[PDB]
Design a protein around this ligand. Sequence first.
Ligand SMILES: Cn1cc(-c2cc(-c3cc(Cl)c(F)c(OCc4ccccc4Cl)c3)c(=O)n(-c3cccnc3)c2)c(=O)[nH]c1=O
Lengths: 305, 301
Amino acid sequence: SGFRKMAFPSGKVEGCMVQVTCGTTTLNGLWLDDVVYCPRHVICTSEDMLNPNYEDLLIRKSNHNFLVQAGNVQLRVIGHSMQNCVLKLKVDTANPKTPKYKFVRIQPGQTFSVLACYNGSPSGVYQCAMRPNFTIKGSFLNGSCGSVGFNIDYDCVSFCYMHHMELPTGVHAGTDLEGNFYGPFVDRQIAQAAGTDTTITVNVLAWLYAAVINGDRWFLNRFTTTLNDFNLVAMKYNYEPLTQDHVDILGPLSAQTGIAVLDMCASLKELLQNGMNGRTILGSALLEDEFTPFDVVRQCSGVTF
Amino acid sequence: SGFRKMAFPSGKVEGCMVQVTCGTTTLNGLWLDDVVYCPRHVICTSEDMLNPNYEDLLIRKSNHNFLVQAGNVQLRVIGHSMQNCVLKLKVDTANPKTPKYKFVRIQPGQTFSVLACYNGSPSGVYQCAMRPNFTIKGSFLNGSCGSVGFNIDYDCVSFCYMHHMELPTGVHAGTDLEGNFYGPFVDRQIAQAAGTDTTITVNVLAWLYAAVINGDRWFLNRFTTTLNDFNLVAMKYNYEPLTQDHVDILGPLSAQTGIAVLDMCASLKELLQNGMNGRTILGSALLEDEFTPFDVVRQCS
Ligand SMILES: Cn1cc(-c2cc(-c3cc(Cl)c(F)c(OCc4ccccc4Cl)c3)c(=O)n(-c3cccnc3)c2)c(=O)[nH]c1=O
């Protein structure tokens, strides 16, 4: 029993984190095989960040403009390359701790673990969701750039996120591991704002199912809504629309609990209009939306890696 | 910026987790040097649940009654001893992944990370706190016994909790790594309720300091309070008493924010009286008590 915001075991990823320095800038790198990956803005000065020409800033650099430390060992950079907003430093040594891995791009509403790092040193791990507005609500300080987000499937690490910047509202923006930004953001020191965020409806429903599985039942009722009716309510409360794929994904949870999805939508519909009436759900006074249906199934069934 | 409940990176603990089997009971063990630590109720049958005589059950076992598996490798047990409620299995191979470690007993309100495991394999990591009633509000299924709680400071893993059991109310009880239970609980299935779960006041105050650090001031007010008047009020909401020790501990956060500890106590008194009124603090709509003063300094600076 119990339900916690649970991150993947981070050991496979810890063994890949290194420190990258260029000029006065130090941030984190991801060392896989004989390549180190880091944000391309490591090559920028404070003046460069205002309007950078990355290809030109990089032509003017050599392999020895890059100091790469793996713990107490210096890694020799023998080549450098840029792929979108990510810098690729070839090194002379393969990482012997390189796990089975792949680079994947996730969809908003999907969750992953972030291994927050500083000077190549892992400091903490936390679970989060990619917001519908493509930001993540992270916890990062100066020096956390280059920290990565990931999922684990069996023994394979799926790297999905690399941290690049903090936005003026305090939320965070980054890229996949092939350097493509998530969201309408650029790696440039200019005014940028994320769009209005919304709540991940299908995740809230999954969390209500986790609540039922753990004995929290007060929000259930005898009623049912329709997808049409609910989505009109959802739109009003800045909730993501619920699709037929969402209902199918919640299928297993509906089977295990005996609460059909549109029954739960009726519960959620009532929770949105009337609130929580001074009660909590799984120790929260808010509707939690950073658990996917798959998260709920895994945590409540005890899947290992 | 931002504030999340971060756990410690789990890699150093992952390299210590093994599977321990005795009879038909299988749970997790912690493999450090040539010793595997696990809950002693691994040696129990269904007929032993109510009044197990552990000394009697153990004397009847030989080394080969214990199957220890590290990954695919079976480890040979060459000796066993019991220390309080923890079994210590001597194995013929030292764990090459053994980190720098120590065993620490923590006090209520302290936080730590849990590496939840089943069959010797990690499922996930999460952060939690020792409640004032000496339980933890974990996430644990059958087969999770032997999972451990830990902090990491520099490169030293301080193990502070080994999971033993889930109480009827859904909360969790365990021991330190010397096998002494936290709280009044025992490893048999007789009735034992946990005391009233109270709120960890010193942690709530530290988290409010974290909110001011991160730019949120809406809950402050122009009042102060005496320590005694604060405690007379807060204890009516089932908050733990705040001691002068706690006040001293909050001193650094007070100095950083310019808000006196007793002034923040005044803000907390008003928050208990008013609630949030539709607002949030650091993304929560409740007062959070699982961040210590030490944690707040750690994540904010
Ligand atoms: C055979 N067997 C047993 C276990 C196992 C044993 C226990 C467990 C162990 C001991 Cl000694 C107990 F006195 C105990 O009393 C529970 C209780 C009942 C009624 C009143 C008060 C109390 Cl306290 C429980 C357990 O609580 N859990 C568990 C389950 C869910 C989450 N967390 C922990 C699991 C196992 O994992 N593997 C395996 O093979």
